[PDB]
Amino acid sequence: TMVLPGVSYNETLLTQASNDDPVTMPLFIGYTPPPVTVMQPVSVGSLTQANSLFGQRGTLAYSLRHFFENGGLQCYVLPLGPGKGEPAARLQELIAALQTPQMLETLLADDKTGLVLVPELSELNEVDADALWYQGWQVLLTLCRQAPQRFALLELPEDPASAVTLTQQSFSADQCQRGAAWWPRLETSYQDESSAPVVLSPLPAVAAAIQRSAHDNGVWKAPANIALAKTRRPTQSILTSQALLDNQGVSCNLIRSFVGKGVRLWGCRTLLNEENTAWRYIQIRLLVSSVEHYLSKLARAYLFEPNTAPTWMKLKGQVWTWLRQQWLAGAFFGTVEDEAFSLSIGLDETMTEDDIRHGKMILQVRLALLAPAEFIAISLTLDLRD
Amino acid sequence: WKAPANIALAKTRRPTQSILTSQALLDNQGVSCNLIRSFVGKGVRLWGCRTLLNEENTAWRYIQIRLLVSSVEHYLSKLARAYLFEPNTAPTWMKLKGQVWTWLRQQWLAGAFFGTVEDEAFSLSIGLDETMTEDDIRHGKMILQVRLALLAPAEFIAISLTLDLRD
Amino acid sequence: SLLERGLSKLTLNAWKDREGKIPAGSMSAMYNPETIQLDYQTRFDTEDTINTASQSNRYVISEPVGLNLTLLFDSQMPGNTTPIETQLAMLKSLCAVDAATGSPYFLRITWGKMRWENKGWFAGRARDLSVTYTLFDRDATPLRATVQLSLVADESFVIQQSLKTQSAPDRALVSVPDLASLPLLALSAGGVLASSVDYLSLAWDNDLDNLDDFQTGDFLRATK
Amino acid sequence: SLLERGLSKLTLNAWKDREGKIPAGSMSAMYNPETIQLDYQTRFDTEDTINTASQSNRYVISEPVGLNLTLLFDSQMPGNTTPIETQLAMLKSLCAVDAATGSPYFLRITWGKMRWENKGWFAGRARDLSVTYTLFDRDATPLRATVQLSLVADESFVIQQSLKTQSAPDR
Amino acid sequence: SLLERGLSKLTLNAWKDREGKIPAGSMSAMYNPETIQLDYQTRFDTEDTINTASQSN
Amino acid sequence: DILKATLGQCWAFPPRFSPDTGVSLTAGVEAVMQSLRVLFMTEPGERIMRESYGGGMHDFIFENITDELLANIHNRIEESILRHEPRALLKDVIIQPDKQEASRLRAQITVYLANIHDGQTLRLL
Amino acid sequence: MSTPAVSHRFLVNFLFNNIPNPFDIAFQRISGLSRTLEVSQHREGGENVRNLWLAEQVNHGSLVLERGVMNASPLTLQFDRVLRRESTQWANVVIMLLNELSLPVTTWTLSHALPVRWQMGDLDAGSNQVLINTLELRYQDMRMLGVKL
Amino acid sequence: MSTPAVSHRFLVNFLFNNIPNPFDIAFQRISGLSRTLEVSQHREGGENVRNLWLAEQVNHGSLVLERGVMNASPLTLQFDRVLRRESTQWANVVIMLLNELSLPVTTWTLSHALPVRWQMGDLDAGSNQVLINTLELRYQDMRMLGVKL
Known part of the structure; x- marks a missing residue:
């Protein structure tokens, strides 16, 4: 009378607790999608929690969907604020926000993640681009050098002789040791609300391949020879741009596609281009x-x-x-x-x-x-x- | 410790009034009540186990x-x-x-x-x-x-x- | 675990038909078996071909999965008050020929979290049963049993047809990858259907123009 | 040896056809068997000739090589966290009749350096399988298995024709 | 139990017909068996149907 | 577009009727999810001449979450997807009691459209 | 560090369901409670240097008790009923050591103990000894308590 | 020559995964670690005078420990959980002898030790003794260290 016990239907998320693996935990540091605290890292569980927190459409929202559909276990997201707009200005306030001393008080007092990742530097492709690329890497390569055990996940611009001038740039040996770039940006299968496809950075697909081949195979194996799940093709192949084969800069990782097998990660070798030091x-x-x-x-x-x-x-x-x-x-x-x-x-x-x-x-x-x-x-x- | 409910009442034809014809007693302003109903594939069932305490946290319901x-x-x-x-x-x-x-x-x-x-x-x-x-x-x-x-x-x-x- | 520590006994449900429409009696047996055993067996016969090119052996029939399971009943310890003849008047009844139809009862063994062969239940009928009473009383109420059940697989026809449509339901709907080709797209469609889907029929059923028409992300439908 | 000291488990790969074109599932089983056994047998029949000049016996058929192998699964020791029903949902599946075609799955057993009968793999289908669970839990998740596999030889026709041309290729 | 503590032996009665109309002799045997055993068994044969839709016996 | 072709088209589960658009229709992948809400909200006996059809979740309503119950819910869900909905596999069904305001069982049923983790040794004793 | 526990002061409490009062009986020689876990060794194929022990089933020991032939207590009248097969009642036993004051420092707390064996001492013409009878129980579970575990 | 090692000073360190702190517990009577290699004898046809021993499988012994009934340590609370089957956690044990100063001269360093048996001492009315309980572990591997091997 008062209560009617029966069978209901609702779409709330039960969730799961603690996947451990701090060393291979990614940390996404994009801007908040347009009630999470403006700075504290947020534990994202399944893909349902990524949509219930951050929506389905954005730039960080597609990178989380491409993380868990590539076999990601758990990710943390560090928000930064409801950014401006006019995307040549969001993308120099992003680097200026990452140079604050309040980034160090959140990365050092974190002890839950171990892969630093800003997937929104892919928007620099639309956009000095070279100046912004070099202080996009070097801010990330010092936040990991300073932190006890963090690894940067970087990327190159698509255009050669803009990716050539970035590898032929000065990085100290201590910093190269901890960070990597995967070059070809990925053309996903997600719609862009129209017939045209969504083109994402390869790095949410990489960070899911790193922590699943460390969960399944052990972290000592390799992050490469992994089939990327929900990608149509890399946007540029190496048979049409023989630049970046110049042995004069930092080591880079190639994402390719094969005939009998799909889009593969095809490299595991750090920014140290040194032949004997085993910190590659x-x-x-x-x-x-x-x-x-x-x-x-x-x-x-x-x-x-x-x-x-x-x-x-x-x-x-x-x-x-x-x-x-x-x-x-x-x-x-x-x-x-x-x-x-x-x-x-x-x-x-x-x-x-x-x-x-x-x-x-x-x-x-x-x-x-x-x-x-x-x-x-x-x-x-x-x-x-x- | 189980529950007194989900029990088929043996020698009853029907309850005299159903809850689909009197939406009063669904008013959440009084003591908890237990409903005796009948189903299609199964007979007259006791359909509640919850005391007169209409309190959400005290486990004396x-x-x-x-x-x-x-x-x-x-x-x-x-x-x-x-x-x-x-x-x-x-x-x-x-x-x-x-x-x-x-x-x-x-x-x-x-x-x-x-x-x-x-x-x-x-x-x-x-x-x-x-x-x-x-x-x-x-x-x-x-x-x-x-x-x-x-x-x-x-x-x-x-x-x-x-x-x-x-x- | 994960909530509480009470035991979950096994329950022996019985029917009369092959399906679950007509329920017979249903008992739960105390004192869990300590060990189950389900034996599979597949019979092969060797080809004695005269041509002597190859050595091989055919598949003839797969013997039904048989389950072995041993129980024990006892009523003299002071927690045990129900006499074991009321508990054995059901095993002797459900593992025998029914009076209504003249057939066994189509039993179904179940345990709380144990998953039998690939399902949460074990259907089938009783091949064997042997009770051996070892203790008695002055008037010989028995009060010690030691039962030795043995069953077969025999599932219903609606469950077996449902598991067949879950593997190759005569459509494939194959996605194409980057750097693809129709001899490879026929091998990936001939693995969904296991029917050697012969690539010229793929380009005719999907209205391809020139045998390279798919564009790295569109689907191709393959029937048979 | 010669590089490192990590173990190499055995892997049970499955197909659907006689050849390797259509792959089914494929599991690797922990806790290596301790002992394999492959039994050969060749059947001969004695010539009961009336002429009594000679004693001899014909060759009739060679029985297929059968492999016996015993495994064990366990999930309560704190390194062992995957429940053994997910590991036995593959042995019970791959050593039974497939739903697609109505046949066994043409298994292939392999070990890191062990060379089976004359090849690096052991093809064939499952004659026999028996799981006997011995321990349980309060809700009876099983968590102890003791599997008793048994297979036959049954190689593919392309491999058997290739081994024939390597001996007397008619020149 | 419930009344007294005397033993009850087993008795082997015999007839001649299928029914109970014609009684033969009838003995009761001292020194009870310690253990009885009654074995049931039902024979099944597997259907080797060519259609391969189902497995049954 | 091909998912709308291969998976059939049917009506929406709450029947919505308009004079402008005749019947609202759920198609494709949304039609499989619409049928799964029908199955577990139906109960056997409630459809005339179709008495096999139903989820049967009213069997479990005063049953004490004691983990004999959560195995019975797992098997009733897995069986009824086999019998009445073979257009959608089953991935896993996870059942948890609600932590705030208990005596609600929450089941997430995950379907399909139809390795021992070696890394943990480096984080144990 | 605190002083270890000596082994010559102990109380034993019994609680049967035949008998309405819980009774306390002084013994001479409580034997000792064991509790084994019954592992089994598995041998893996490629591994020759380590061992593998798999846990199975906890085995409890037996409670062997000794006291002199004294007046008929409610426990020797109860073994007489069980060993004549007139009852099969079992009891919850509580055994506890005592420190210098009176205080229980450890408690062993057996459950569903069943009397299974009586054993009488020897009658000898030159002996100079008390007639000791030996009692023995099989219990189902065991749960040790106290501050000195 | 340097003086041999006597056997009445020894430390034992335990490390469980339930318990966050490594704890050090004093024992009375560590039994002794064996390690057998389990050869088998083969007999050849024509050879009657020599033997042939074939190496198979290394068998490790068992760690039997004895201490008095004292206050509840983190190890007797841990055997209570394992023998009640509430956990199956095992520990890395480090045993080491000490010389005259403080220095560890030999170290034995057991791996994945599992508590398998508790054994209580006798309760006797005329006894004059400390109640000693016997603990027993089965480990997987063993690795001896130190300068006095």
């Missing part, structure tokens, strides 16, 4: 920072302990156990343990008595990592035999 | 909550008065916890209480400075606290459908 190869930078994230989790468990020799060996025994299990899981190179990793805490091994009295506890880890199979050098031998 | 917790009153006070004219020493306090903890754990494993671990199903707290005081002991009291976590009915099923495009 994205999965090397993301594996060793996934070991930073856990070994510093059990290090600060033994933090406000005495500096006596028992607590040094309580810490080696826990780190040696964990590193041996990851070697037997396939994460490190080496057919014996002596060439896979090493630990060396001690009083006259790493520390000294002056280091102990200042309250330090210094532990050394050496690692041996795996190399990709980027080139297959087939040979044929006849072997006559009568 | 839902008839089976009032009847479960008084079925626990009836047995826990049966073994309490077994330990009644005992001393107020600390052995007889723990003789009483051990019997109540055993019984409450068996009803949790029988499905009567909510909680996937025992710490969130029930609790017991007899003692000298936990429930009692030394003034309570000299007046001959023995105070035992039970906390419970109970089950909620499935009164509303909120179906949703999602398309999940996939090429």
Whole structure:
């Protein structure tokens, strides 16, 4: 009478809680779509939550739809405000907002994400464009250098000799180490409210391929050889623009399409164009920072302990156990343990008595990592035999 | 602990008035009422379990909550008065916890209480400075606290459908 | 888990027809089996061809999935008060020939979260049953049972037809990728239908102009 | 060995046709078998000739190579989080009659360096399968499996014709 | 139970016809069996139909 | 446009009639979602000469969320999509009690149109 | 650090359903409660250096009790009924150690304990000993409490 | 030559995933870690005088621990959860001997140890002893470290 218990119908979202994986968590830093707080990062769960917060049409809204339809697990969005309009002015207030010291108080006091991404620098293609591109990268490459474990996801402009002049620009070695560019911008299958297709940056498709091939295969594998789901084609192929093959700038990653298989990510190699330093190869930078994230989790468990020799060996025994299990899981190179990793805490091994009295506890880890199979050098031998 | 509703009434032709002809009593301004209806493929059903408390948060609605917790009153006070004219020493306090903890754990494993671990199903707290005081002991009291976590009915099923495009 | 810690017994529902229209009795059995076992088996026969080009073996028939399951009943422990003959008057009845029609009862075994072969239930009829009473009383009320059930697969025809239309329902609706071709689009349409869809029929059924007409995102309909 | 120490599980790939043109699902099974077994058998029949000059026996047919293999699944140890019904919803599916055509799925078992009968893979179809769940939960999610697979040889016709031309190609 | 504690043995009655009209001898056997066992069994045959729409027996 | 062709056209579930446009019609992918609201809002016996057709969710209305219930809801949904709607597969159905104002079961039913995660070893002991 | 618990002061409380009063009986030699989890070792194919232990089923021990032949208590009259098969009643047992004052420092709290064995001591002409009888119970669950766990 | 290691000073560190802090617990009687390789003897046809041992599978022992009944530690609260089947968490254990100063001379470093057995001591009226409870773990791998191997 008072109540009628029965079967209803509604489209509310139940949601899911905590996907962890802080190292491969993307962070989208576009402008708010036209009641989230103007600065705090917002946990976006499924694609239903991305529409219930941010609508369906925009620039950040299509990048979230292209994130979860490429196999993304969870994303965070850092809003910035209801931007102006006249998009040559939104896109120099975007860079000016990212240079504020209030960006550092939100990225350093975050500890939930690990892939910095601004997908709205793709709008610079419409639009000095070169000046805006270089202080678009270099602002992102310093927010990650400063932060303990963040990786930038960058992109090149479509026009060659504007993407050539960006790679032939000065970036310090410390900064290159942590950030990557994928060149060909993606033509999606989303309508633009008319017959014409929506062209998005490749980077929401990349950040979904990074954290699903780190969830499925492990973060040590590679982010490449991944079929991009809901893309028609990359807007430009490498057979029509032989620029960017000039070996005089930062390493770039190519997104291509094949015949028997679709649009593939076809590279994993950081902005370091150095042949011997193993801080190229994205999965090397993301594996060793996934070991930073856990070994510093059990290090600060033994933090406000005495500096006596028992607590040094309580810490080696826990780190040696964990590193041996990851070697037997396939994460490190080496057919014996002596060439896979090493630990060396001690009083006259790493520390000294002056280091102990200042309250330090210094532990050394050496690692041996795996190399990709980027080139297959087939040979044929006849072997006559009568 | 289950519910008194969804029960087919045996030897009834029909309820004398249906709710489709008298939309009064749907006014949310008075005591909770229970509706007896009839369905098409199934007969005259009791269609409610919710007490006269029309309060949204106080869990003294839902008839089976009032009847479960008084079925626990009836047995826990049966073994309490077994330990009644005992001393107020600390052995007889723990003789009483051990019997109540055993019984409450068996009803949790029988499905009567909510909680996937025992710490969130029930609790017991007899003692000298936990429930009692030394003034309570000299007046001959023995105070035992039970906390419970109970089950909620499935009164509303909120179906949703999602398309999940996939090429 | 995730809400509470009460057990979920298994329930043996019975019908009379192949479908669920006519319900017979339905019991839930205490003291869960500890172990189930469902055995699949497929029979193959070797081709003794004289030509001796190849070695192969045909597919003849797939034997029905059989389920083995062992129960126990007991009524003398003081929680157990229902006599076990009232609980065995249903297993002996439902796993035998019904008086109405002269057939078995088309049982359906179910468990709370256990998913049988690919469904949430196990249909079928009882191949075997053996009760072996081991304890008794002075007047010999039995009060110990040890039942040894064994069933077969036998699903209904509406469920088996519904699972068939969920795989290749005689239309494909194949999307085209970037850098595509009709011999590749026929292999991707011949995998949705498993029928070798012979590319010249694709360009005729979809009104292609010149065998390269699709434009990286439009669909092609393939029937048979 | 020779590079690293990670394990290589076995992978059960499935098709629909005899050849590799139409792929069905494909699972990799954790907890390697500990022991494989492939039994060969060739049937001979004795010549009961009346002439009594010689004792001999003909060749009739060679039985297909059958592979026996036993697996185990478990999800309650805290590394194991995927429920074993999602892993057994593929073995029960791939070792049964497909809904599309009405036939088995032409499985292909493979291991990282193990070389089956003379090839790097073991083709064939599933003769036998038996799952026996031994542990459960309060709501009885199973979380212990003990699978007992058994297959036959049945290779494709293009591979069998290619191995024939490699021995006496009529020149 | 419920009245007394004397045992009840099993009795094997015999007839000659199918019904109970003609009684033969009838013994009761001391020292009860400790365990009975009654086995049921139903035989099914699988339909090898050529149409391959359904699996049944 | 081809999804409107392959998936049939039918009327809307609340019948909306106008003198300007005759009958409002749901077509294509929206027609499959319209039929799924019909199935779980119908109840068996409520359609004359079609007594098999219905979701049957009134069986579960005073039943105590105790997780014997949530398996029964999962199987009733999965079976009734097999019997009465084979135009749409089933992906997963997730049932949660409502945290604010409990005794509401919320089920999200996800359909289709019709690997062991190795990365977790680097975040465990 | 706090002092460990010695093992020569203990109370045992029984609660049957035949018997209306809970009774407390002094024993000599409570044996000891075990609780095993019954793992099983699995051997994987390619792995030769580590082990794999899989948890199955918790096994509880048995409560063996010893006291002298004294006057007939409500518990030796109850084993007499169960071992004559006149009842199959079982009890909730509470066992607890005591510290220097009176206070229960640990409590063991058995559930549905069933009397299963009586064992009489020896009658010997030169013996100089109290006739001790041995009692033994099988319980279903066990739940240890207290501050000294 | 350097002096051998005596066996009456030892620390044990536990690290569970339920419990956020690593805790260190004093025991009385750590039993001893074995590690067998499980060879098998093969007999050849023509060879009657030599043997042939074939290596198979490394078997690890078990960690049996003993301590008195004291206040509830984070490890006896953790065996209570595992033996009630509320968790199946296992820990990385570090055991190490100490020399005269403080220094760890050998370290044993067990991995994924699972609590499998609790065993309580005897309650006896004339006993004069501390109530000792026996704890037992099954681990997956074992890796000994230190300078005194």
